[PDB]
Structure formats: C-alpha cells, structure tokens
Design a protein around this ligand. Structure first.
Ligand SMILES: CCCCCCCCCCCCCCCCCC(=O)OC[C@H](COP(=O)([O-])OCC(O)COP(=O)([O-])OC[C@@H](COC(=O)CCCCCCCCCCCCCCCCC)OC(=O)CCCCCCCCCCCCCCCCC)OC(=O)CCCCCCCCCCCCCCCCC
Ligand SMILES: COC1=C(OC)C(=O)C(C/C=C(/C)CC/C=C(/C)CC/C=C(/C)CC/C=C(\C)CC/C=C(\C)CC/C=C(\C)CC/C=C(/C)CC/C=C(/C)CC/C=C(/C)CCC=C(C)C)=C(C)C1=O
Ligand SMILES: CCCCCCCCCCCCCCCCC[C@@H](O)O[C@H](CO[C@H](O)CCCCCCCCCCCCCCC)COP(=O)(O)OCC[N+](C)(C)C
Ligand SMILES: CCCCCCCCCCCCCCCCC[C@@H](O)O[C@H](CO[C@H](O)CCCCCCCCCCCCCCC)COP(=O)(O)OCC[N+](C)(C)C
Ligand SMILES: CCCCCCCC/C=C\CCCCCCCC(=O)OC[C@H](COP(=O)(O)OCCN)OC(=O)CCCCCCC/C=C\CCCCCCCC
Ligand SMILES: CCCCCCCC/C=C\CCCCCCCC(=O)OC[C@H](COP(=O)(O)OCCN)OC(=O)CCCCCCC/C=C\CCCCCCCC
Ligand SMILES: CCCCCCCC/C=C\CCCCCCCC(=O)OC[C@H](COP(=O)(O)OCCN)OC(=O)CCCCCCC/C=C\CCCCCCCC
Ligand SMILES: CCCCCCCC/C=C\CCCCCCCC(=O)O[C@H](COC(=O)CCCCCCC/C=C/CCCCCCCC)COP(=O)(O)OCCN
Ligand code: SF4
Lengths: 70, 98, 156, 318, 175, 105, 83, 115, 71
C-alpha cells in the first residue's frame, strides 16, 4: 504494498504546496516583504492612501519612521 | 440623471413590454415578470446606495422575498393549466369568452 | 533529417499515450464476459495496465466482443461500434465471437464478428483464460506501439 | 505580477487534479485487493499524462441533434467556475481578499450546477435529460440545508470573511464545537459534488454515463477535470471551516503544510466513502435532506443563534 | 468616460433583458435572465452593495434552476425557438437592440429629455459621496437593522411566506 | 382610506423608515440629512398646500442635494470650456492638475 | 403524565431525529430567558465604541462627566476585564 | 479589477482548451457516427418531448425556503445590535415560522412524490 | 488629526479648483466665478466631481473605485 500509493499522494501534496506558498511570497515581494495590508473597511483604505501620500514615491509600503519628524 | 439610471429604466420598460406581449407560452411571461422584479431591485439598491439611506437597505431584500411569492404563485397556476390541456399555451385560456 | 526526427518523437509520444490508456467499453455478451470480469479481478487487475471499463461508447477506445453475436444483436453491435470516436480498436474474444464456435452452423448466429466490424486481435479459446485475454490486450498495446501515423503523414 | 499569481494558482490545481485521479484509482484498487495503475511509468506516476494526451488527441463529437452553442459553452463554464472557486480561500493569505468570501463561494456553487443542466439539455439525448433533471433534484435537495449549516457555523465567526476563520480557531477546532453541523456539512459536500453515494447525475449503473454521455475527448476531459477540482475545493473549504490550523505570521509555510495535509486527508476520506457504500435514490436523497437534515439543521441554527447571547460569547467585527 | 465599466455593465444588462424579453423559449429566456442577474450583481458591486448583489445573484440562480425543471417538465416543444429560428423573435430582438442604441446615442450626443427629464451622463463616478468614516459597512448595518428596527417587516414577511406555502399547496391540490 | 392606527396607539409601525433623518443605526447620517431636516422642520404644521409655495427654497436645495443636476451642468460647462481652450491652445493646465503635485496627509 | 411517557418512548424508538430537533429548539427558546449572561452580552455589545465620542461643552454643572479619559468619572469596564 | 482579470483568465483558458481539443485531432464525422445515442437501437420519440416531474411542489417550496435563507443570512451582523432581546425574538420567530411551514407541508403529504 | 488633515486637503483642493475656474471662465461674460448652486449659505460637503473634476483619470479612478476594487 500500500505504500506505493504514497508517491502519487506526495506529488499531489507538492502541487497543493505551490499556490499558497507562492501567494505568500508574492504578497511579500510586491509590498516590501511585510504581509500585504488588508483593507476590509474604508478607514483602513484611508490609512493606506494616507501612507501612500506621505511616502512620496507613491508606494504605501514605503513606511516613514520617527526620523521624518526632525 | 446618470446613464445607469436610464439603462435600468429602459430594462424595466423592455421587460414590461415583453410581458404585455404574449407569444405562446406562459413561462416566458413569468420570466418577464421576474425580469421586471430584477430591474426594480437593481434600481432600488442603486438609489439607496447613492443617497446613504441606511435604514432603507432592508427594503430590497423584502422586495426579493415577495418576488418569490409572485413567481411561486405563477408556477402553481401554470401547473394546473398544463394539467388541464397538456400545454401552457395562452390560446387555450379562452373558455371565458362566452 | 530534423523534421523526420521530430515527427518520429511525436509518434513515440502519441503511441505511448494511446497504448498506456486503453478504455474498453463495458460490453459483454456471453460466457466470455465472466472471464473478462475475472480479468478485472484482483488476481490479474487489468487496471494496473491503465485499462478501465467505461460504459459510454463515446469515452472508450477498445471494444471486446466477448460472446456469441446473433442476428438480433448485430445491428446494436455495429451501432455501438460506429459511435466510438476514433482511433478505435476491436478485440474478438472466444470462438463464438471469432468464427461462430459451437454455434457456427446456427441459423441465428453471426459467423464471426469480423463480418460486422474490423477486428484487430483474435483471442482463441472457449472461453480464453483471463491470462489469454491479458496477453491479447498487451499484444494490442504492442501493435499500437508499432504504428507510425505522423511519420507516414510527413512522407506524403 | 498578479498574472503570475493567477497562473501559479491555476496550473498546480490542474496538476493536482490529474494526480488526484491516479491516487483515487490506486486507493480504490488497494481497498479492493488490487494494485491500481503501476505499469505506466514508475508507480503509475505517468498515467495522468497518458490520459490527458490520449483524450486531447482523440476526435471530439458534435451530435446531429445537439444545440452546439450550449454544448460547447457548458464545459467551459464548468471548468472556469471550478478554477474561480479557489481564489477566495485563504491559505494562509487569499489570492483575492473578499469581505464576503463565503457568500461568493455559495454563489459560484449555484453557478456550477447550471453547467451540468445545460450540457444535458443541449445533448438532445434521453439519458442526458434524465441526468440533468437528477442534478436539478439534487440541488433542490441540498441547497437550503447547506446554506443554513454554513450560516449556523459562521455565527461563531462574526463575519463572512474566510481569513477570520483562522483567527476564530486559534485555540480549538470548530469540529469540537459544532460536530453535528460538521457531519451534516460533510454529507452536504458529498451531495454537492455529485459524489458517491450521491453520484446520481452521472449514474453509471443506471444512465450509462448520465449527462455527459454524448461528451467525448477534450470536453469530457474538461468536465472530469472540473469535477475533481470542485472535489478538492470543497474539501479545502471544509478543512478551513472546521479544522483551523495554526497560522504563524512570520512563517506561512506551517499553515500551508497543515492545510494541505488536512485537505488531502478529507479527499482520501471522500475516496473511502466512495469505495465503501452503495448509491442512493434521488427521491431517497431528497427525503433524507428534507425529513432528516432540515429539522435538525433548523434546531441547530436556533441553538447557535441563542448560544452566544445567553453565554456572552458574541464574536467581534460587526 | 472612465473605462465605461458601469456603462458597459448596464449595456449588457439591457442586452440580456432584450434577449429574454423576445421570449426565445424558456431555456434561453432563463439563460438571458441569469446573464442579466450576474451583470446586475456586478453593477451593484461597483457601488458598494456587495451583499445585495450576491444575494440577488444567489436568489435568482436558485430561482432559475426551478424554472429549468418546470420548463423541461411542461414548457417544451419539439423544436425550441432560438433568437434566429423565427422571424418574430429575431424582429423583437433586433428592434430592442436598435432601440437601445438609439437611446444611448440620443443620450451621449445631446442632453435632451427622453421620458423623465434631460440628463448629463459624464460617467457615474461623479455622484459619489467622498465618504470617509466607519470601521464597518453601511449596507451591512442597514440590512442587519431588519431585526432590531424592522419588527413589523419581519412579521409581515414571515406571515406572507407561511401563507404562500399554504397557498401553493391549496392551488396544486387539484381535484 | 387612511385609518391612522399608529397615531391613535403610538405604535411606530413603519414611521422609522419614512425619512432619511430618523435614527439611523450607529448614528450614520444620510447624504442630505441637513437639507431634509430643514425642509421637514420648515414645512411642519402648515399643510401641504402652503408648504408647496412657502417652502420651495428648502425643497429646491434638498432636490439639488439628492440629484445634483445644477452642479452637473456647471461642471460640464466648465469642462467643455476648458476643452475648447486647450484645443485652441491657450490654457496650459498647472502641474498639480496633471498628477505632478506634492501630496499631503 | 403517564401517556406522554409512552408517546415519547414511541417517538424515540421511531423518529429520534424529530425528538432531538424539538428538544434542541425548545432549549434554544427557553434557555436565554433563564441565563444571567445575556445582560453581560448586551452590555458588551453596548460598550464597543464604533462611534467617536463627541465632547460636551463645559457649563460647570457636570460633576459626573470626565474632563480627561483617565479621570475617575465615567463608565468603567473592569467587569469586562474580569469577565 | 483583479477579480475581472481572474475571471477573464479562467474563461480564456477554458475556451482555448476547447479550441485545441477541437482543432488538434483529426475529425471524421459521418451520419451514423453523430447519430443520437441510445443503448443499441434508434430512439422512438424525441428528447424534446415533455418530461414529467414528480417534485414540482418540492421545487416551489425550495424557492420559498431559498428566500427564507436570504432573510436569515444577515444574522451574524444582526447579533451585534444593542437590544439583543428583540433581535433574538425576531430570529427565533422567523425560524419557528420556517419550521411550521415545513411541518405543514410534511403533514399534508406535500413531501411525497406524485405517483 | 485625520479629521483636521482631511479638512485641510479638501479646502486646498476646492481653492485650487476655484482659482482654476476663475482663470478659465473669465472669457464668459455672465459667468459668476465661485457661484454656489444652493440658496442656503451653510457649508455643503463636496461631491467628488467638484474635487477631482479637473484632475487626471487615474486619480479619479483611485478616488472612486480605489477602495472597492482593492481586494
Ligand atoms: C448581438 C447581441 C449580443 C450577441 C451575443 C453573442 C454573439 C453571437 C456570435 C456567434 C455566437 C453564436 C453562433 C452560433 O449560433 O453557432 C455558430 C456555428 C453554426 O453552427 P450550426 O450547427 O450550423 O447552427 C445550428 C443552428 O443555426 C442553431 O444552432 P444553436 O441552437 O446551437 O444556436 C443557439 C445560439 C444562437 O444564438 C442566436 O440566435 C443569435 C445570437 C444572439 C445571442 C444574444 C441573446 C442575449 C442572451 C443574453 C445576453 C448575452 C450577453 C451578450 C453580450 C453582448 C455585450 C458585449 O444561441 C446562443 O448561442 C446562446 C448562448 C449565448 C450566451 C452566452 C453567455 C454565457 C452565459 C454563462 C453564464 C453567465 C454567468 C453570469 C455572467 O456553430 C459553430 O460554428 C460552433 C461554435 C459556435 C458556438 C460556440 C460558443 C458560442 C460563441 C460565444 C458567444 C459570445 C459569449 C461571450
Ligand atoms: C469502476 O471502474 C472505474 C474506475 O476504476 C477502475 C475509475 O477510476 C473511473 C474514473 C475514470 C478514470 C479512468 C479517470 C480518467 C482519467 C481522466 C479523465 C484524465 C483527466 C486528467 C487531465 C485531463 C488533467 C490535465 C492534465 C495535465 C497534466 C494538467 C496540466 C494542464 C496544462 C495546461 C498545464 C471510472 C469512471 C470507472 O468506471
Ligand atoms: C507542452 C505540452 C504538450 C506535450 C506534453 C508532454 C508532457 C510530458 C511528457 C511525458 C513523458 C513520458 C514519455 C516517456 C515515457 C515512456 C516510458 C518507457 O517505459 O517507454 C518505453 C519506450 O519509450 C517510449 O517509446 C518513448 C515515449 C516518448 C519519446 C520522446 C518524448 C517526446 C516529448 C516531446 C513533447 C513536446 C511537445 C510540444 C507541443 C507544443 C516502452 O515502455 P512500455 O513497454 O510501452 O511500457 C512498460 C511495459 N513493460 C512493463 C513491459 C516494460
Ligand atoms: C393592539 C391589538 C392588536 C390586534 C391585532 C394583532 C395582529 C398583529 C400581530 C401583533 C401586533 C404587532 C405589533 C408589533 C409592532 C413592533 C414594535 C413594538 O412591538 O416594539 C418592538 C418590541 O419587540 C417585540 O419583539 C415585539 C414582537 C413580539 C411578538 C411576536 C410576533 C407575534 C405576532 C402575531 C402574528 C404573527 C404571525 C405568526 C403567529 C405565530 C420593538 O421594540 P424595541 O426593540 O424595544 O425598540 C426598537 C427601536 N429601537 C431600535 C430604537 C430601540
Ligand atoms: C484556430 C482557428 C480558430 C477558429 C475558431 C472558429 C470557431 C468555430 O465556430 O469553428 C468551429 C469549431 C471547430 O469545429 P470544426 O469547424 O468542425 O473543425 C474544423 C477543424 N478541423 O468549433 C469550436 O471549436 C468552437 C470553440 C469555441 C471558441 C471559443 C469561444 C467561446 C466563448 C464562450 C464564452 C462564454 C463563456 C461562459 C462561461 C464563463 C462565465 C463566467
Ligand atoms: C458572474 C458573477 C459575478 C460575481 C462577482 C463577484 C466578485 C466579488 O464579490 O468580489 C468582491 C469585490 C469587492 O467586494 P468586497 O469584498 O466588499 O471588497 C472591497 C473591500 N476591500 O468586487 C469588486 O472588486 C468589484 C469589481 C467588479 C465586480 C465584477 C463583476 C463582473 C460580473 C460578470 C461580468 C461578466 C462579463 C459580461 C458578459 C457575460 C456573458 C456574456
Ligand atoms: C491539457 C492536457 C492535454 C494537453 C493537450 C496538448 C497535447 C499536445 C500533443 C502533442 C503531440 C502532437 C499530437 C499529434 C497527433 C494529432 C492527431 C493525429 O494523429 O493526426 C494525424 C494526422 C494524419 O493525417 P494523414 O495521415 O495525412 O491522413 C489520414 C486520414 N486519411 O497527421 C497530422 O495531420 C498531424 C500533424 C502534426 C500536427 C502538429 C503537432 C505539433 C504539436 C501541437 C500541440 C499544441 C499544443 C498547444
Ligand atoms: C417548541 C420548539 C419548536 C421549534 C424547534 C423545532 C425545529 C424544527 C423541527 C420541526 C420541523 C417540522 C416537524 C416535523 C413534523 C412531522 C410530523 C409527521 O407527520 O411525521 C410523521 C412521523 O413523525 C410522527 O410520527 C409524528 C410525531 C413524532 C414525534 C415528533 C416530536 C414529538 C415530541 C418529541 C419532543 C418532545 C419535547 C422535547 C423533549 C425531548 C425528550 C427529552 C410521519 O412520518 P413520515 O416521514 O411521513 O412517514 C415515512 C415513513 N413511513
Ligand atoms: S466462446 Fe465458449 S465461453 Fe465464449 S461465449 Fe462462446 S460458448 Fe461461451
């Protein structure tokens, strides 16, 4: 044997690994590697737009620290 | 009045005209009734979302509910009509001519 | 040359794909159908060769005529043979489907299914053992492997 | 960059379906004292490739009596819906993050049923029409019970967001809280995907092949691919809903691994149930859903509405 | 004039309405109504009415399935009519499409009244609210207020549904 | 015709939904809350016949807030004049009207 | 009270699903009225601040209205912290 | 925008798969090949003929219960209201009416198929 | 702080639109620059057409469908 079923299952598992993992990596690579923001409500969207305007590069994930308050 | 309002109104008018014209089948008339209900629902929710009438948002759902009743009603009647003639033709519903 | 090599590789790929997936129709007529069922039994396990029964003719690649073919059944057998999408193959199992067998001189028996449909492999016996039918199926797989379609097309 | 994400979410599920069939065939063989596909490549690993190539190099058939437009449209719609269902699910993070993801899944589930009906009707065949009507009856049987079960389960979640189900089950699986609804949901998923003991639409022993009896070659392959993708999708949804894996924000790999393992276990259980039981009658299936599942589901819905209020356990995120 | 997405969706809505209004057999009528229902779901998705659109799509899809069973049961003929299989159906379809094109050209080209009043068009993105407030969804709380505020509505709707079940049973009793 | 049972018993069967300015959940305001409240207050108790004429200004403002017809006409005229000017070529819009501005929080 | 035992026996032997559903529904109906945590649930729902608390203008006659959030005046959620 | 792209991608892939499935293999269809399928013989009537349904009443009731579902769905949000007693009363009343309608149909042989 | 910043942004956008309209519409003889369409003198919240009307299409789309399409 019954362990001859295991290889095919493993292949399936490997295939089922690809989407989720890949998605996570994408959500990192395009957002500075910090877990792409979730905006379910208008307040979170307003925060994202405010950060995008603050950054100056038109990218919300470019965060500004305390060093910008001279 | 924006374009989408015109398009929804024209869809309602088209469905109404389709209901007012009978070809052979009662099922198509019932479908026209359901289409008019869909157009009404879309228009209602568009107006309620445009002007933030929060307490009005339950109205469209209620609308849909009563749609079912009409639809349900029609289906029931249609069955009986078939059970009397074997077809849903409106041409058979003419015994009350005399 | 290069084109001939490419079409030869395509022939190998297509032939392997076809022969590794043979779906006989769930079609049986008489005694030999029981031995065909015994070929699907755990001891022989035709499934392990990629061979699975499918009821619909449209989803089948092979027809195994296992049993006597009568004059009443010949039109139905021909009709289910026609509805098979091509490429299609026919395997004649048992003496009754081969040449009439025990009922060759009967008034209501078709003397061989090759009168109705073209037959690729003849399996002899009454009935053939499940091993004999398995050998016939593998012989059909080899015959499919030997075929050369795109190579002949390229030489046209 | 998003197109790459769509492709990396599309191709692996197709490979997994091709592979799932091999696993399914092999498991059934070993449960029936036989081997399953082993000659074609090592341990039958190349069987899916052979099946795909053979089906796609075979001639498709266009019946003379069939209405061609619907006949062609139906498999396209089925496969497209089966692929679209995957995006809402979060593993750990969803490809498309919907405020109402569960409603999206329910709506697409309804959409999938229509494709089965259309293919049968367009075939202009008696068996196809019987299969289409059987699918109509099956949907009539399972839809309302499925929706009410889903609402009752999500009442403990506080929203229809699928990602929140990870946070709700941070400490305990929901199977320990709503196991009657869990069993009913498993039966509802078996009926939804037309799987044994509810494979009445195909009906191999009764209706030859059922709705797709006239279908062959590529369209049949797409139907079969779609059927398997729906199976995997529904099992993944069940694993997300009832067996909440632990998500580490700094390592999504652990959640992905656990989610994959649970999905595979549920799929193997599906194959097991196929291997172990006979087939229902669709009138008997409707009677089971209505006279047995529906009253208890209504009672469970009332109980699950009451319990947060009387227990002071109302979930957040109004 | 901004990607015309809402305009395109409303145009497909009215096109499906013309499709099922010409009455090309109930199967294709249901197909057209399903297309229009999904399109209207998208239309109200664009404005922020996600729950209502999904609900409309969900209710209609379920409703449509029942119609298909009925059409097959008692609303079928030997040769179902399609939009191009009959002179009357094709004429109605073409007339509806031409009327839609005429009204849309009359709207974009000039700001003149057709039925109700003269309008502006210019894209529906203009009539938005600039609403920046809320950790919730206004539509969500509006619908949820059916149980706290809409006690009368709930009572009348439930009584209507119960009476409807009794009504269909009585009508299809037969005898 | 009208049997005002609600007024007789003080029941509030369906009056909570009649107007846009009547106790929305979570105190969420309507789009034209102020205009509607002005029209209602200034039209109260004087009857429909009088409130048709005496109350025309507030109802005019309320209808404008609902439908934004005059604002649409004004904006369309401004845009048409700007388009004609740029076609003639004597306008040169400023950088902040072309996405080349300095954003602020 | 004697025949009802026989009726429940017959129902449990014949239709256990209906008995279970009716029992669950009756419990769901009657239990919330007898529970002391429903008021806690109401208070928790009321204490969630979706809305911005608009300040009150000072007139010198509000001993019970805080001037700062940390002041002893105003509602407290220590019961929620201990709940 | 992204969901539109995903739907377009899925539809494009399925349509192209049909295209290759129909244009790659060699097509040889004749009248006997594309004839309608019965088991062995020609069908007597047509599949477009009326096909009796024995669960019409169940279909109408499914419609009504489907709309009851639309009524019940916003309950997760409705559970967050301040006055929980009235919301609970309304939800219980709605479900009791649903159960009562189901019981009424059950008792009057409404769930039995026509014979 | 967000409330204050929003007030400042909308005020500055309205002032930019007002100055731009004063520039463009000067040629029209009977055009009153900055004329309101409401009889009342109280503040009326803008309409999103009065703020982004003179701006590019991308900003219009980001303001109108930016939140809805973000999933
Ligand atoms: C103009 C208005 C808008 C037009 C819409 C489509 C444009 C039509 C262009 C050609 C398509 C049909 C050609 C044809 O009939 O066969 C040709 C040809 C002739 O074969 P034949 O055997 O000689 O003909 C036999 C007889 O003539 C009779 O054969 P038959 O009975 O099989 O023909 C029936 C056919 C004939 O149709 C007609 O009579 C005229 C066509 C007008 C249809 C429009 C009616 C309105 C319906 C609702 C609105 C639909 C949306 C419209 C969008 C417009 C805005 C962009 O009816 C249909 O095709 C109906 C299906 C179309 C709807 C597709 C929508 C998918 C719905 C999925 C669910 C939705 C989810 C939520 C969203 O057949 C082929 O060569 C094989 C392939 C052709 C069909 C493949 C798939 C269809 C093509 C895709 C359509 C576009 C979808 C996007
Ligand atoms: C009791 O007997 C029976 C069985 O048991 C012996 C069965 O298994 C069984 C089920 C049918 C099997 C034979 C499965 C058939 C195999 C499929 C139809 C093949 C489908 C797989 C492909 C089409 C998926 C696509 C393949 C690609 C590699 C995926 C990637 C695609 C690219 C574009 C990338 C039946 C019906 C049966 O009757
Ligand atoms: C890009 C999409 C289109 C193509 C998709 C291709 C998918 C991947 C390719 C699949 C790889 C498998 C092919 C090779 C497997 C053969 C294994 C070997 O055993 O075969 C032997 C002989 O090998 C085969 O003849 C060779 C087949 C393939 C030859 C070249 C491959 C060509 C691939 C080119 C693909 C490019 C297409 C591009 C389209 C756009 C004989 O085996 P056989 O005896 O029978 O069975 C075992 C029975 N036993 C037990 C008695 C031993
Ligand atoms: C007076 C004589 C009447 C004779 C005719 C009787 C026929 C009509 C049915 C009964 C009368 C309906 C009156 C109910 C109107 C609802 C409003 C009122 O009752 O208050 C509600 C009280 O809620 C109760 O739940 C009322 C309903 C309880 C009765 C159950 C329904 C039974 C009706 C019988 C017919 C239904 C058909 C099915 C029968 C089984 C809500 O109060 P509250 O929540 O504080 O405030 C909400 C406003 N907020 C949000 C600002 C706070
Ligand atoms: C490569 C050349 C492409 C030509 C396409 C022409 C299509 C056509 O009608 O031709 C028929 C052609 C092949 O038949 P034959 O002519 O007999 O074979 C000739 C080759 N030996 O049939 C087909 O393959 C049709 C394929 C469909 C094309 C794709 C378009 C379908 C669009 C459907 C959209 C609806 C989707 C609905 C579901 C999604 C909802 C969310
Ligand atoms: C087919 C049925 C269409 C259903 C589409 C469902 C998509 C959906 O629900 O996603 C939700 C998402 C936003 O919802 P929230 O969860 O609240 O997220 C915002 C807060 N961050 O929707 C959107 O992004 C809006 C974008 C437009 C929606 C797409 C509508 C498309 C409808 C189908 C049209 C198909 C083409 C027409 C021809 C078909 C027939 C020929
Ligand atoms: C999604 C899962 C499946 C993936 C689908 C893609 C499969 C890719 C298959 C690649 C291998 C190539 C298959 C070739 C076999 C096609 C069918 C065939 O055998 O045609 C035979 C036919 C015989 O004709 P004649 O002998 O002249 O006349 C006899 C009748 N009197 O020969 C041909 O015409 C075929 C010519 C070769 C076609 C070119 C193939 C190149 C690969 C295309 C793959 C497309 C992928 C995208
Ligand atoms: C007060 C709370 C109520 C709300 C909660 C209930 C939620 C939903 C449950 C009700 C749904 C509908 C009820 C079903 C009514 C069916 C009656 C009927 O006629 O069915 C009988 C079958 O049932 C009966 O025999 C009649 C009544 C049987 C008992 C029903 C419950 C009686 C009371 C049990 C619970 C008592 C209170 C709870 C205590 C639990 C014990 C500790 C006929 O059987 P058939 O299926 O048609 O025949 C096929 C096989 N020949
Ligand atoms: S060959 Fe022998 S075993 Fe086979 S069908 Fe004929 S008589 Fe029966």
């Amino acid at each position: 044997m019954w362990f001859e079923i295991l290889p095919g299952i493993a292949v399936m598992a490997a295939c089922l690994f690809i989407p989720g993992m890949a998605t996570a990596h994408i959500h990192k690579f395009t957002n500075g590697g910090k877990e792409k923001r979730v905006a379910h409500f208008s307040y979170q969207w307003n925060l994202m737009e405010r950060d995008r305007r603050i950054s100056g590069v038109n990218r919300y994930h470019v965060t500004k620290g305390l060093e910008n308050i001279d | 009045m924006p374009l989408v309002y015109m398009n929804i109104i024209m869809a309602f008018a088209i469905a109404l005209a389709g209901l007012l014209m009978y070809r052979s089948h009662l099922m198509s008339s019932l479908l026209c009734l359901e289409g008019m209900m869909l157009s009404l629902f879309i228009m209602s929710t568009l107006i309620i979302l445009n002007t933030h009438f929060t307490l009005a948002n339950m109205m469209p759902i209620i609308l849909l509910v009563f749609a079912a009743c009409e639809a349900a009603l029609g289906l029931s009647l249609l069955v009986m009509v078939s059970n009397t003639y074997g077809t849903d033709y409106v041409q058979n519903l003419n015994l009350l001519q005399c | 040359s290069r084109g001939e090599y490419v079409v030869a590789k395509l022939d190998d790929l297509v032939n392997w794909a076809r022969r590794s997936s043979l779906w006989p129709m769930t079609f049986g007529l008489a005694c030999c159908a029981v031995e065909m069922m015994h070929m699907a039994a755990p001891r022989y396990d035709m499934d392990r060769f990629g061979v699975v029964f499918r009821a619909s003719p449209r989803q089948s690649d092979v027809m195994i005529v296992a049993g006597t073919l009568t004059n009443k059944m010949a039109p139905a057998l021909r009709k289910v043979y026609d509805q098979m999408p091509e490429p299609r193959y026919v395997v004649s199992m048992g003496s009754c489907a081969n040449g009439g067998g025990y009922y060759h001189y009967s008034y209501s028996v078709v003397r061989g299914c090759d009168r109705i449909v073209p037959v690729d492999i003849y399996v002899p016996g009454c009935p053939p053992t499940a091993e004999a039918l398995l050998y016939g199926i593998l012989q059909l797989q080899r015959k499919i492997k030997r075929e050369k379609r795109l190579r002949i097309w390229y030489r046209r | 960059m998003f197109m790459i994400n769509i492709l990396s979410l599309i191709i692996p599920i197709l490979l997994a379906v091709a592979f799932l069939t091999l696993v399914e065939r092999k498991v059934l063989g070993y449960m029936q004292l036989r081997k399953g596909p082993n000659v074609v490549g090592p341990y039958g690993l190349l069987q899916p490739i052979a099946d795909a190539l053979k089906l796609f190099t075979k001639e498709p058939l266009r019946p003379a009596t069939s209405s061609i437009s619907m006949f062609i449209i139906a498999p396209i719609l089925a496969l497209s819906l089966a692929l679209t269902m995957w995006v809402p699910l979060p593993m750990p993070y969803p490809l498309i993050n919907m405020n109402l993801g569960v409603l999206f899944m329910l709506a697409m589930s309804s959409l999938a049923v229509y494709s089965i009906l259309w293919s049968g009707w367009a075939s202009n065949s008696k068996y196809a029409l019987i299969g289409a009507l059987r699918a109509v009856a099956q949907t009539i049987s399972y839809e309302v019970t499925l929706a009410i079960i889903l609402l009752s389960v999500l009442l403990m979640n506080g929203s229809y967001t699928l990602s929140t189900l990870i946070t709700t089950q941070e400490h305990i699986w929901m199977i320990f809280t709503s196991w009657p609804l869990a069993m009913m949901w498993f039966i509802s998923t078996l009926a939804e995907t037309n799987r044994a003991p509810f494979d009445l639409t195909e009906g191999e022993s009764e209706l030859v092949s059922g709705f797709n009896v006239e279908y062959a070659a590529g369209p049949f392959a797409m139907f079969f691919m779609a059927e398997y993708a729906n199976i995997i999708m529904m099992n993944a949804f069940t694993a997300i809903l009832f067996l909440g894996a632990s998500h580490d924000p700094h390592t999504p790999e652990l959640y992905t691994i656990n989610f994959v393992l649970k999905t595979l276990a549920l799929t193997i259980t599906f194959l097991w149930i196929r291997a172990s039981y006979p087939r229902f009658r669709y009138d008997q299936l409707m009677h089971l859903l209505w006279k047995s599942f529906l009253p208890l589901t209504l009672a469970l819905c009332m109980w699950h509405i009451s319990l947060p209020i009387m227990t002071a356990s109302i979930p957040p995120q109004s | 004039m901004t990607m015309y997405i809402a305009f395109i969706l409303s145009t497909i809505f009215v096109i499906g309405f013309v499709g099922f209004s010409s009455k090309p057999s109930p199967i294709y009528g249901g197909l057209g109504l399903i297309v229009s229902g999904g399109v209207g779901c998208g239309i109200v998705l664009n404005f922020g009415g996600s729950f209502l659109g999904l609900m409309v799509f969900l209710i209609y899809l379920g409703g449509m399935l029942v119609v298909f069973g009925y059409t097959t049961a008692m609303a079928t003929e030997m040769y179902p009519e399609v939009w191009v299989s009959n002179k009357t159906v094709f004429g109605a379809f073409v007339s509806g499409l031409m009327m839609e094109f005429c009204m849309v050209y009359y709207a974009l080209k000039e700001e003149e009244v057709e039925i109700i009043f003269k309008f502006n068009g210019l894209g529906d993105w203009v009539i938005y609210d600039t609403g920046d407030s809320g950790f919730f969804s206004e539509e969500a709380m509006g619908i949820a207020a059916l149980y706290s505020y809409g006690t009368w509505l709930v009572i009348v709707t439930g009584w209507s549904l119960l009476i409807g079940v009794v009504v269909i049973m009585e009508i299809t009793r037969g005898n | 015709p009208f049997f005002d049972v609600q007024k007789r018993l003080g029941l509030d069967l369906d009056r909570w939904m009649t107007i846009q300015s009547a106790e929305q959940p979570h105190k969420i305001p309507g789009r034209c809350h102020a205009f509607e409240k002005e029209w209602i207050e200034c039209a109260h108790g004087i009857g429909g016949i009088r409130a048709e004429k005496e109350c025309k200004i507030e109802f005019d403002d309320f209808v404008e807030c609902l439908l934004r017809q005059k604002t649409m006409k004004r904006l369309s005229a401004i845009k048409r004049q700007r388009d004609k000017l740029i076609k003639e070529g004597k306008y040169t819009p400023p950088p902040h009207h072309l996405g080349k501005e300095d954003p602020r929080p | 009270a004697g025949r009802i035992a026989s009726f429940l026996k017959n129902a449990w032997a014949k239709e256990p699903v209906l008995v279970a559903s009716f029992a669950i529904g009756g419990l769901a109906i009657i239990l919330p009225s007898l529970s002391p945590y429903t008021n806690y649930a109401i208070r928790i729902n009321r204490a969630t601040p979706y809305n911005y608390p608009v300040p009150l203008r000072d007139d010198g006659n509000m001993p019970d209205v805080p001037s700062h959030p940390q002041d002893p005046q105003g509602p407290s959620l220590e019961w929620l912290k201990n709940l | 925008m992204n969901i539109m792209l995903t739907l377009l991608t899925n539809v494009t892939l399925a349509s192209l798969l049909v295209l290759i499935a129909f244009w790659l293999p060699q097509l040889n269809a004749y009248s006997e090949k594309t004839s309608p399928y019965e088991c062995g013989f020609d069908p007597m009537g047509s599949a477009r003929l009326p096909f009796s349904m024995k669960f019409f009443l169940v279909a109408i009731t499914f419609l009504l219960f489907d709309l009851e579902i639309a009524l019940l769905l916003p309950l997760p949000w409705a559970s967050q209201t301040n006055n929980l007693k009235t919301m609970l009363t309304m939800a219980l009343f709605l479900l009791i009416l649903l159960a009562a309608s189901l019981a009424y149909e059950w008792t009057q042989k409404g769930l039995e198929w026509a014979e | 702080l967000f409330q204050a910043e929003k007030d400042r942004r909308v005020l500055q956008m309205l002032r930019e639109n007002l100055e731009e309209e004063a520039i463009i519409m000067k040629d029209v003889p009977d055009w009153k620059v900055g004329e309101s369409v409401f009889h009342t003198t109280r503040w009326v919240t803008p309409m999103m057409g009065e703020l982004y009307g003179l701006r590019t299409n991308e900003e219009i789309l980001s303001a109108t469908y930016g939140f809805i399409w973000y999933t």
